[PDB]
Amino acid sequence: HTPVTVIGLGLMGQALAGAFLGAGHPTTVWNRTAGSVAEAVAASPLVVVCVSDYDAVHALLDPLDGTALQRTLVNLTSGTSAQARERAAWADGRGADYLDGAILAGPAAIGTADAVVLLSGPRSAFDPHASALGGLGAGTTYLGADHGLASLYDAAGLVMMWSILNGFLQGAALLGTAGVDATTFAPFITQGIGTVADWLPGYARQIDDGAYPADDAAIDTHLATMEHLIHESEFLGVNAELPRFIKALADRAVADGHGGSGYPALIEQFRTH
Template sequence: MHMNSERPAVTVLGLGMMGAALAGAFLAGGHPTTVWNRSAGRGDDLVAQGAVRAAAVGDAVAAGQVVVVCVRDYDAVREVLEPVRAALAGRVVVNLTSGTSQEARDLAGWAAGHGIGYLDGAIMMTPQGIGTSEAVILYGGEQELFDESRPVLERLGGGATYLGPDTGIPALYDVALLDIMWSTLNGFLHAAALVGTEKIPATAFVPFATGWLGGVASFLPPMAEQIDAGEYAAHDATLETHLSPLGHLIHESRIRGVDADAPGRTRAMVERAIDDGHAADGYARLIEQMRER
């Protein structure tokens, strides 16, 4: 692919909240932008900002050098792109639809078979953050294709982060980072339920929670080094040391009528590791149980 202008024409397929935000960012960056959505009635605001609304997906594809797809799932991506695969040859498709790493790799194989440039991406931001410096979007695919597309992709904000030629890696990062998000949110909800039994408002507790999260984040780099090395010697607290406060958390939860299943699962992992002879190891040792299970 060769971008033939300073502001290459972009097509956005899919005008849900995220797709509309992507199109808005391209318009704000000065790119001729064509939009299409399977169901009619979306995109009026974008048209008012200067976008061209295509009546058919084929017309939309023909208008863009870069075709950005953001729809429900990978099945929907196939349904949209398969009928216009011939028109996509020589263009670059940037798929920002959420899915699995295998789905991304399969779609990349389909695109390669039809002479279509393909990048797969994962958006780690809400629609409201698209186009801002805080936006994080991860990409995988052919390096040359990414480098040529980067000036366009950077319009979405925060720079474009390239993770290498494997199109499945952004989706893997996506689910792994969401794993951290859900675990953190669930931990906060559990903690808020605990302090709430004493009529302490969640808003009063949240400064303590956010301050503590900063401390927890500082634990991650040394843990990551231990994981990569496969060596789990305790530098701060042993697994045996963790066992007692986990018991306190479970007891406190039960007597206050708060669900204790999550801390119970954590304690069970610690107990198994101790039973396996790792009482003196650090918390990072538990990754081996997660891998086994």
């Protein structure tokens, strides 16, 4: 329906440009290895940027004439909320609408229901291009006004991801000591993940009030079991840092008199240092 530019053609850049062409957009394109970045920007009212990091964004966009963006810039590069909030300020000083986003999917998933693409920024920047941007997948989702949100969501997703992979590896190492294969273990552990996931909405309700009922599973009672996990790990000669970390956090909660509360009282530990 409308012209769009794509800047940066890593795997993901290509995929993004692919989806825009495949949805019938007159699509202009530019890469490191259109004549120039300025030519690419001048081509379309909607400009999408996907490059390795915000330093590259800085390097490609800062040198532009002050008039060049006076346009909606959508920055799907991964970075911190502070980086996103800076670019928002910069873009506003250059007279552009700015959305900051993050891609939580591989290039293959772009343009499909598997794609997840988070966008944050003011409705006035998003609504006019909602259709165009929906071309990247039904998982394309507008999170709200604060330009930092996509980065923060991406961070919550990443920390959870590494958390799970690390718990999986710790388990595989433990069971490995008795000769159980990782593929034998996996079906068991994926059932368990599902079960724990279903506890999260309720744990969310507890965190949103400041109320952490024990429900017969108080932090105290966790403690003995966490010690076992450590002893087990040390004794079999596998790494015990993760189980010690886990017990360290719960010790702090106990020391702040939260021993009697449910596990979600540990959110206080994750809020300080």
